[PDB]
From a paper:
(e.g. Candida albicans, Candida glabrata, and Candida auris) and Saccharomyces cerevisiae. Previous work has shown that A. fumigatus Gna1 possesses a classic GNAT α/β-fold, forming an obligate homodimer. This dimer shows extensive secondary structure swapping with substrate and cofactor binding to the two active sites that are formed by channels on the surface of the enzyme, composed of amino acids from both AfGna1 monomers.
As an alternative approach to achieving AfGna1 inhibition, we aimed to exploit the protein tunnels that connect the dimer interface fragment binding pocket to the substrate-binding sites (distance of 1 to substrate-binding site = ∼8 Å). To test the ability of a bifurcated derivative of 1 to bind AfGna1, 3 was synthesized. This bifurcated fragment introduces an N,N-diethyl alcohol moiety into the scaffold and displays a binding affinity of the same order as fragment hit 1 (5 μm). An AfGna1–3 complex structure, which additionally contains Glc-6P, indicates that 3 is accessible to the fragment-binding site, despite narrow tunnels linking the fragment binding pocket to the enzyme active sites. Like fragment hit 1 and 2, the important binding interactions and binding mode are maintained in the AfGna1–3-(Glc-6P) complex structure. In addition, the hydroxy functionality of the N,N-diethyl alcohol moiety displaces His-127–coordinating water molecules and interacts with the acceptor nitrogen atoms of the His-127 side chains.
Residue numbers in the entry:
A (entry chain A), B (entry chain A): 26 to 190
Write the structure that this text describes.
Amino acid sequence: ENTPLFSPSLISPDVLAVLPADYTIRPLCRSDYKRGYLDVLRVLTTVGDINEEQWNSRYEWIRARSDEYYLLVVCDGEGRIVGTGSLVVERKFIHSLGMVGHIEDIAVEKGQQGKKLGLRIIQALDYVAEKVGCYKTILDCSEANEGFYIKCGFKRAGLEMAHYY
Amino acid sequence: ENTPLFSPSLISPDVLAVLPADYTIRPLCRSDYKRGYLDVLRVLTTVGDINEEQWNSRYEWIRARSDEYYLLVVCDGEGRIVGTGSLVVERKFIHSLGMVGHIEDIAVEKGQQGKKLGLRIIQALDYVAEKVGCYKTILDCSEANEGFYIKCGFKRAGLEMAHYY
Ligand SMILES: CC(=O)SCCNC(=O)CCNC(=O)[C@H](O)C(C)(C)COP(=O)(O)OP(=O)(O)OC[C@H]1O[C@@H](n2cnc3c(N)ncnc32)[C@H](O)[C@@H]1OP(=O)(O)O
Ligand SMILES: CC(=O)SCCNC(=O)CCNC(=O)[C@H](O)C(C)(C)COP(=O)(O)OP(=O)(O)OC[C@H]1O[C@@H](n2cnc3c(N)ncnc32)[C@H](O)[C@@H]1OP(=O)(O)O
Ligand SMILES: OCCN(CCO)c1cc(Cl)c(-c2nnc[nH]2)c(Cl)c1
Ligand SMILES: O=P(O)(O)OC[C@H]1O[C@H](O)[C@H](O)[C@@H](O)[C@@H]1O
Ligand SMILES: O=P(O)(O)OC[C@H]1O[C@H](O)[C@H](O)[C@@H](O)[C@@H]1O
């Protein structure tokens, strides 16, 4: 299936305009399993082993929530996935039933790093978040990659704390 | 309506066992609008103005997702809400289609602070997260409240970064 996860109208036109020639940013679709999506996530952390039937199940759970999960991909000239980025919109009671944008799982293929593809992904995810009416966008990072997020216009706002099971 | 948001079986029995006499922790229900729920959230940040019809709409959106949004309350001997705590379970592709527990919007009524109610809320939310199969629980905090989260068993794991709109 080639049906976008969410509306292509949510993709930043200004970002599309300034990508390198023949590169694009678009919503995830189900067939992206075959276009090297999970490969790109291997630069981020352990993906483990995921067959197409498991893919299709998780894809459908997410599609049943395309009003929360905004997953998009960067594609090169040859339609290969070279970049990934997620926004998850949390609904709150606070801030007059406000909404918070959470940026997750930003990855660019090693051979493709250092070309602004990460920046375009963040600019696209910030465009989605503003447009669906989030009051702020937040994310968690390491010391080692804080400087990328500063170059994207993010500011330090507190501490991530964790409990492992 | 007095129907729990989620199954009371997800409430930590060990936490219920050690609360102060006549205090309880239970899932949110829709009638909690009248039991001072939003009052408690006033200690956390701006709630703004929220009528019962807006409450009912947001409550129903969340109930349509009680497999993601685990909101629970602490009640005193007189059935007043004195504490609130949220877990939101993110679905991932990474970690073999893993799940991450996000702790949000922890609040205890000022007159009721310093009695372990915050600790019981975190222990209850960590019980939910393990039980539905999260690989870790994370949250964002300030320097000023990092020491509460350390006493709860959390460790510093990175930086929260933010963009405001
Ligand atoms: C919320 C999260 O998901 S945090 C997890 C982030 N992901 C990872 O760490 C996975 C591994 N790394 C990557 O996949 C990528 O390198 C990313 C996404 C961090 C950055 O993407 P790239 O395409 O490599 O970066 P891009 O070229 O857009 O960088 C923008 C600017 O930041 C700089 N930059 C990139 N990474 C870093 C860094 N770690 N520290 C400081 N500066 C950096 C670039 O040099 C560029 O600088 P310029 O504007 O002065 O040219
Ligand atoms: C993920 C998030 O939501 S972060 C936002 C947190 N919420 C807020 O900041 C709102 C305002 N504060 C509150 O509502 C509450 O005070 C809470 C939730 C922070 C803590 O709840 P309380 O019921 O006050 O704390 P509780 O009594 O369970 O505290 C556990 C221990 O931590 C201590 N503690 C409580 N707050 C702090 C703090 N800010 N710094 C250091 N230690 C603290 C207590 O003294 C207690 O110590 P002990 O085990 O040595 O007795
Ligand atoms: O900054 C993103 C990390 N957080 C904050 C606390 O862990 C986060 C991430 C997601 Cl993806 C979510 C979320 N998950 N589903 C809906 N929203 C929430 Cl509440 C918080
Ligand atoms: O595999 P983990 O330990 O969860 O880390 C994987 C990544 O997930 C999230 O998107 C966080 O923003 C990153 O800080 C983290 O690098
Ligand atoms: O009103 P905000 O600026 O979003 O802050 C309100 C709270 O929301 C979240 O639960 C965060 O964990 C806290 O760090 C923050 O205090």
